[PDB]
Paper text:
Phosphorylated p62 binds with high affinity to Keap1 (Kelch-like ECH-associated protein 1), an adaptor of the ubiquitin ligase complex for Nrf2 (nuclear factor erythroid 2-related factor 2). This binding inhibits Keap1-driven ubiquitination of Nrf2 and subsequently results in stabilization of Nrf2, which then translocates into the nucleus to induce the transcription of numerous cytoprotective genes encoding antioxidant proteins, detoxifying enzymes and multidrug transporters. The DLGex- and ETGE-binding motifs in the Neh2 domain of Nrf2 bind individually to the same binding pocket at the bottom surface of the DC (double glycine repeat and C-terminal region) domain of Keap1 (refs 36, 37), which forms a β-propeller structure composed of six blades. One Nrf2 molecule binds to each Keap1 homodimer; this interaction is crucial for rapid ubiquitination of Nrf2.
After screening 155,000 compounds, we identified one with the desired activity: N-[2-acetonyl-4-(4-ethoxybenzenesulfonylamino)naphthalene-1-yl]-4-ethoxybenzenesulfonamide, which we named K67. X-ray crystal structural analysis of the complex between Keap1-DC and K67 revealed that like Cpd16, K67 binds to a pocket surrounded by basic amino-acid residues at the bottom of the β-propeller structure. The conformation of K67 reveals that the naphthalene ring fits into a pore formed by Gly364, Arg415, Gly509 and Ala556. The benzene ring of one ethoxybenzene moiety interacts with Tyr525 (pi-stacking) and Arg483 (hydrophobic contact), and forms hydrogen bonding with Ser508. Although the benzene ring and ethoxy group of the other ethoxybenzene moiety interact with Tyr334, Tyr572 and Phe577, sulfonyl oxygen between naphthalene ring and ethoxybenzene moiety interacts with Ser363, Ser602 and Gly603. In addition, water-mediated hydrogen bonds are formed between K67 and the side chains of Ser555 and Arg415. Next, to investigate the interaction mode of DLGex and K67 or Cpd16 in the Keap1 pocket, we constructed a model of the Keap1-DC–K67–DLGex complex by superposition of the Keap1-DC from the Keap1-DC–K67 and Keap1-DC–DLGex structures. The model illustrates the coexistence of DLGex and K67 in the Keap1-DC (Nrf2-binding) pocket. A hydrogen bond is formed between the carboxyl oxygen of DLGex peptide Ser33 and the ethoxy oxygen from K67, and Gln26, Asp27, Asp29, Leu30 and Val32 of DLGex and the ethoxy carbons of K67 engage in hydrophobic interactions. The unique feature of K67, distinct from those of other Keap1-interacting compounds such as Cpd16, is that it can inhibit the interaction between phosphorylated p62 and Keap1 without exerting any effect on the interaction between Nrf2 and Keap1.
Residue numbers in the entry: 325 to 609
Write the structure that this text describes.
Amino acid sequence: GRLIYTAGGYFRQSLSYLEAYNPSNGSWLRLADLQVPRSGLAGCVVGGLLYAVGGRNNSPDGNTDSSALDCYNPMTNQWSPCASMSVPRNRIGVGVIDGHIYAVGGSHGCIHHSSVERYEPERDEWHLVAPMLTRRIGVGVAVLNRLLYAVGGFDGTNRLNSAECYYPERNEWRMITPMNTIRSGAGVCVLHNCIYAAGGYDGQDQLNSVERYDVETETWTFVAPMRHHRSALGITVHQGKIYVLGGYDGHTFLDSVECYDPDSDTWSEVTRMTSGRSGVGVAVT
Ligand SMILES: CCOc1ccc(S(=O)(=O)Nc2cc(CC(C)=O)c(NS(=O)(=O)c3ccc(OCC)cc3)c3ccccc23)cc1
């Protein structure tokens, strides 16, 4: 019984929620709030612990990007601080390879990072690795075949359809085939050996479209679109289906969670979050 955990997010201000969804019975758990509110974070899991990485606290008193790494233990229902990153990273992307967390891109005020750093939980230390070829905020990250892909985003001037691949053993990045569509703030994940990029913002509108990358054919193909157009959506994969959570549709902050079934190539409404929000961090344990 693994749960879908959603941390933080934004509606009127950054949020402190930690909620978990159990797909096998439809139930939502209300778990311990984050110590500091944050939106534009990413979530991931190492060792059955949930990590909240980066983001920003957009509050009525003002706006502060986060270099924070916090760790939630589902056994104790408690958040514990970890070593902070080298730099704050709002609108960050994250991936895990061999039990190490990669923090990719993101912003600190006006600085759009190309830099990438790696956390080792066993030593509680971050270290920089080779930077990306492109500065990317609002970037999606997927891990596939022990390689890390950085997909789309915004480089400070252009919104991106480009994507790139990081080779940990070699410590190098290479550009891959660009997507069909410019996307920042998309949900990017891996399912059944393909990278999926769902939604985002193309410079003009929120998107419902979804495309997937086949690493051997080197081509992106559109699949069924989502039921809602969404940017700043959370994403994860649970039992062979993609789950997308919240986001901003151009007018409203959505509470909709939808599910992609790769067998039928369809999306379905599965549940609603307790309140609409965007810019959450999501992970499954
Ligand atoms: C009226 C819409 O207001 C908001 C306010 C805050 C958020 S948020 O979720 O807390 N912040 C973020 C904000 C944004 C930009 C905003 C303010 O929408 C991100 N990037 S983005 O969605 O690529 C995006 C969306 C729309 C844009 O044009 C005008 C509204 C530009 C870029 C994000 C990408 C990933 C994660 C978080 C993002 C999202 C929307």
